[PDB]
Design an enzyme around this catalytic site. Structure first.
Site, PDB file in Angstrom:
ATOM      1  CG  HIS A   1      -1.944  -1.118   1.167  1.00 14.25           C
ATOM      2  ND1 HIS A   1      -1.741  -2.284   1.872  1.00 14.25           N
ATOM      3  CD2 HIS A   1      -3.128  -1.264   0.528  1.00 14.25           C
ATOM      4  CE1 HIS A   1      -2.758  -3.100   1.674  1.00 14.25           C
ATOM      5  NE2 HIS A   1      -3.613  -2.509   0.859  1.00 14.25           N
TER       6      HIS A   1
ATOM      7  CG  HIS B   1      -7.052   4.058  -3.892  1.00 15.48           C
ATOM      8  ND1 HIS B   1      -5.874   4.076  -4.606  1.00 15.48           N
ATOM      9  CD2 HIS B   1      -7.200   2.795  -3.432  1.00 15.48           C
ATOM     10  CE1 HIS B   1      -5.337   2.865  -4.585  1.00 15.48           C
ATOM     11  NE2 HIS B   1      -6.122   2.074  -3.878  1.00 15.48           N
ATOM     12  CG  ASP B   2      -5.071   2.107  -0.672  1.00 17.30           C
ATOM     13  OD1 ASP B   2      -6.106   2.089   0.040  1.00 17.30           O
ATOM     14  OD2 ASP B   2      -4.789   1.124  -1.373  1.00 17.30           O
TER      15      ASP B   2
ATOM     16  CG  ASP C   1      -8.041  -1.092  -4.736  1.00 12.55           C
ATOM     17  OD1 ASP C   1      -6.827  -0.778  -4.595  1.00 12.55           O
ATOM     18  OD2 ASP C   1      -8.725  -1.428  -3.754  1.00 12.55           O
TER      19      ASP C   1
ATOM     20  CG  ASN D   1      -2.905  -7.637  -7.530  1.00 11.40           C
ATOM     21  OD1 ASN D   1      -2.762  -8.843  -7.327  1.00 11.40           O
ATOM     22  ND2 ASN D   1      -3.501  -6.824  -6.647  1.00 11.40           N
TER      23      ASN D   1
ATOM     24  CD  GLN E   1      -2.668 -14.101  -4.764  1.00 13.56           C
ATOM     25  OE1 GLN E   1      -3.119 -13.353  -5.628  1.00 13.56           O
ATOM     26  NE2 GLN E   1      -2.649 -13.781  -3.471  1.00 13.56           N
TER      27      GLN E   1
ATOM     28  CG  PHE F   1      -7.993 -12.302  -3.972  1.00 14.72           C
ATOM     29  CD1 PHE F   1      -8.928 -11.639  -3.187  1.00 14.72           C
ATOM     30  CD2 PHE F   1      -7.234 -11.570  -4.869  1.00 14.72           C
ATOM     31  CE1 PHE F   1      -9.094 -10.265  -3.307  1.00 14.72           C
ATOM     32  CE2 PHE F   1      -7.402 -10.189  -4.986  1.00 14.72           C
ATOM     33  CZ  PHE F   1      -8.333  -9.554  -4.210  1.00 14.72           C
TER      34      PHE F   1
HETATM   35  N1  LIG Z   1      -3.147 -10.358  -4.795  1.00 14.14           N
HETATM   36  C1  LIG Z   1      -4.004 -10.285  -3.787  1.00 14.14           C
HETATM   37  N2  LIG Z   1      -4.196 -11.394  -2.994  1.00 14.14           N
HETATM   38  C2  LIG Z   1      -5.083 -11.374  -1.948  1.00 14.14           C
HETATM   39  N3  LIG Z   1      -5.793 -10.233  -1.664  1.00 14.14           N
HETATM   40  C3  LIG Z   1      -5.603  -9.134  -2.432  1.00 14.14           C
HETATM   41  C4  LIG Z   1      -4.718  -9.122  -3.500  1.00 14.14           C
HETATM   42  N4  LIG Z   1      -4.777  -7.887  -4.053  1.00 14.14           N
HETATM   43  C5  LIG Z   1      -5.673  -7.136  -3.363  1.00 14.14           C
HETATM   44  N5  LIG Z   1      -6.185  -7.910  -2.354  1.00 14.14           N
HETATM   45  C6  LIG Z   1      -7.207  -7.607  -1.336  1.00 14.14           C
HETATM   46  O1  LIG Z   1      -8.062  -6.546  -1.746  1.00 14.14           O
HETATM   47  C7  LIG Z   1      -7.949  -5.455  -0.851  1.00 14.14           C
HETATM   48  C8  LIG Z   1      -7.880  -4.185  -1.705  1.00 14.14           C
HETATM   49  O2  LIG Z   1      -7.940  -3.005  -0.936  1.00 14.14           O
HETATM   50  P1  LIG Z   1      -6.583  -2.223  -0.569  1.00 14.14           P
HETATM   51  O3  LIG Z   1      -5.717  -3.281   0.169  1.00 14.14           O
HETATM   52  O4  LIG Z   1      -6.899  -1.169   0.436  1.00 14.14           O
HETATM   53  O5  LIG Z   1      -5.821  -1.803  -1.848  1.00 14.14           O
HETATM   54  C9  LIG Z   1      -6.705  -5.742  -0.016  1.00 14.14           C
HETATM   55  O6  LIG Z   1      -6.819  -5.241   1.295  1.00 14.14           O
HETATM   56  C10 LIG Z   1      -6.561  -7.238  -0.017  1.00 14.14           C
HETATM   57  O7  LIG Z   1      -7.281  -7.845   1.031  1.00 14.14           O
HETATM   58 MG   LIG Z   2      -7.768   0.735   0.101  1.00 15.53          MG
HETATM   59 ZN   LIG Z   3      -5.876   0.087  -2.885  1.00 13.06          ZN
END
Ligand SMILES: Nc1ncnc2c1ncn2[C@@H]1O[C@H](COP(=O)(O)O)[C@@H](O)[C@H]1O
Ligand SMILES: [Mg+2]
Ligand SMILES: [Zn+2]
Length: 321
Positions: A74, A114-115, A228, A231, A279, A282
Site C-alpha cells: 500500500h 485512494h490509499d 484497485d 493485479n 491467490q 481470491f
Molecule cells: N493479490 C491479492 N491477494 C489477496 N488479496 C488481495 C490481492 N490484491 C488485493 N487484495 C485484497 O483486496 C484489498 C484491496 O484493498 P486495498 O488493500 O486497500 O488496496 C486488499 O486489502 C486485499 O485484502
Molecule cells: Mg484501500
Molecule cells: Zn488500494
C-alpha cells in the site's frame, strides 16, 4: 540516459501491463508523480481545468510523500498502478464520450489518493486493536475515510490546490464524486457494489447509455474498484510481484496479531500459509466475479484482460499439486 529510459517506459501509459516497478525506480521513486503528470498531459486536463503545472507537481509530490515508504504493497507504486489502470479503463471503447471531463478528473484524482497514509494493516485490525483511526471513524470505512481526509487536506498546502480554478459548483461536485468513489474501495462494500453492477449489466442500453448521476457514479465506483483489484489481471511477472508484496504485508500484520494474543487473520500466518491457494481463492471468489461482470458491461473490450486473469488463475492452480 535515465530520463530517456523513463520516457521510453512511459510510452506505454495507455496500455494494460505498464512496467510500473521500472518506472518507480527510473523516476527516483516518484511513480505516482510522473504517471499522474503524464496522464494529465495526455488527457489535456491542465488546460481544461486551468491547473498550473508547478501546482500539479507540488501537490503530487506532497501526496506521494504521504504514502509510506516501508509498506510493501500500500505504497506510492500501488497508487500509481491504480491511477494508470483507471486511466486505461476510462479509455475503453464502450465508454467513449460517456463521462464528462469533471467525472474523468474525479476518477483519476480518487485513484491517486485512494490509499494515502495507509499503515499496512486492515480495517478489521484497526477495529480489533481499538486504534485511534477506528475510534475517530466509528469502525466504518475507517481507512477509506482517512485516505479521503488526507488527500483533500493536502490541497491546502502552499501551491498545492490543483482545483483553484474550478468553479464552486465544480469543486462541490468533484468533492462528492471523489468521496463516493474512494468509499466504494472499502472491501466490506464489494458484494453490494458487485450486485449493483450486475443489475446494470442486465438492464444495459447502448456505446453504453448512462444518464443519471446514480448510474454514472456506480460505474466509476466499480471502475476504480476493478483498478484497485487489477493485479491478478496483469501480465504474470507483474502479478507475482504484487502477490509477493501483499503477502509480506499480510504476514507482518499476522506477526503483530500473534504478538498481541489475537487470532491470526486469514492469509496472515507465515507458519500456516499457502500463497498459491490464497491467490486461487481470491480470484475465484472476488476478482473473477468482479472482472467477468465488468467485461460483460463493456463486452468485448475487456476480453484480453479477462483472458489474462484466467491464465494467471490456471498458472497459480497448476503449482498446487
Ligand atoms: N493479490 C491479492 N491477494 C489477496 N488479496 C488481495 C490481492 N490484491 C488485493 N487484495 C485484497 O483486496 C484489498 C484491496 O484493498 P486495498 O488493500 O486497500 O488496496 C486488499 O486489502 C486485499 O485484502
Ligand atoms: Mg484501500
Ligand atoms: Zn488500494
Amino acid at each position: 540516459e535515465q530520463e530517456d529510459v523513463l520516457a521510453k517506459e512511459l510510452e506505454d501509459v495507455n496500455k494494460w501491463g505498464l512496467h510500473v516497478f521500472r518506472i518507480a525506480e527510473l523516476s527516483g521513486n516518484r511513480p505516482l508523480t510522473v504517471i499522474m503528470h503524464t496522464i494529465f498531459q495526455e488527457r489535456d486536463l491542465l488546460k481544461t481545468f486551468k491547473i498550473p503545472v508547478d501546482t500539479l507537481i507540488t501537490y503530487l509530490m506532497t501526496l506521494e510523500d504521504h504514502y509510506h515508504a516501508d509498506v510493501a504493497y500500500h505504497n506510492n507504486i500501488h497508487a500509481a498502478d491504480v491511477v494508470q489502470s483507471t486511466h486505461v479503463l476510462l479509455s475503453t471503447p464502450a465508454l467513449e464520450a460517456v463521462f464528462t471531463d469533471l467525472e474523468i478528473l474525479a476518477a483519476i484524482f480518487a485513484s491517486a489518493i485512494h490509499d494515502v497514509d495507509h499503515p499496512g494493516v486492515s480495517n478489521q485490525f484497526l477495529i480489533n486493536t481499538n486504534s485511534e483511526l477506528a475510534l475517530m471513524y466509528n469502525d466504518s470505512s475507517v481507512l477509506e475515510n482517512h485516505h479521503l481526509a488526507v488527500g483533500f487536506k493536502l490541497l491546502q498546502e502552499e501551491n498545492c490546490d490543483i482545483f483553484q480554478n474550478l468553479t464552486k459548483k465544480q469543486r462541490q461536485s468533484l468533492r462528492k464524486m471523489v468521496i463516493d468513489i474512494v468509499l466504494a474501495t472499502d472491501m466490506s462494500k464489494h458484494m453490494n457494489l458487485l450486485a449493483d453492477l450486475k443489475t446494470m449489466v442486465e438492464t444495459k442500453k447502448v456505446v453504453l447509455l448512462l444518464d443519471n448521476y446514480s448510474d454514472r457514479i456506480q460505474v466509476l465506483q466499480n471502475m476504480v474498484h476493478c483498478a484497485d483489484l487489477s493485479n491478478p489481471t496483469k501480465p504474470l511477472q507483474l502479478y507475482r510481484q504484487w502477490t509477493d508484496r501483499i503477502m509480506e504485508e499480510f504476514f507482518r500484520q499476522g506477526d503483530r496479531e500473534r504478538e498481541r494474543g489475537m487470532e491470526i487473520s486469514p492469509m496472515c500466518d507465515k507458519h500456516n500459509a499457502s500463497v498459491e491457494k490464497s491467490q486461487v481463492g481470491f480470484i475465484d471468489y472476488i476478482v473473477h466475479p468482479l472482472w467477468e461482470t465488468w467485461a460483460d458491461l463493456v463486452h468485448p473490450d475487456a476480453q484480453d484482460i479477462l483472458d489474462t486473469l484466467e491464465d494467471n488463475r490456471e498458472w497459480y492452480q497448476s503449482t498446487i499439486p
